[model samples]
Target: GSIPACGESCFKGKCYTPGCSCSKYPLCAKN
Candidate 1:
């Protein structure tokens, strides 16, 4: 349906940006 992710919603902020902890954790944990 909608964006299939946590940071894909109406999430607009610094934490949702690149080079941040929020995005970093998912990438790292997946591998």
Candidate 2:
């Protein structure tokens, strides 16, 4: 799979969705 933003894995050890652009600090979900 592709890498996530912030150059790391997601908080839940998951990858971002097709159009996810969430921030690292806040780690909020992106539309």
Instruction: Return the top candidate by TM-score.
Output: 2
- Per-residue lDDT tens digits for candidate 1, residues 1-31, read 2123334322344444333344343321111
- Candidate maximizing lDDT: 2
Give a tens-digit lDDT track for model 2, residues 1-31. Answer: 2233334435654534544444543343443
TM-score, cand. 2? 0.21
Off by over 4 Å in 1: 1-15, 23-31
Worst 10 residues of 1 by lDDT: 22-31
What local lDDT does model 1 show for residue 16? 43
Could you tell me how far off, in angstroms, the CA of residue 8 lies in candidate 1 after the best superposition?
Answer: 13
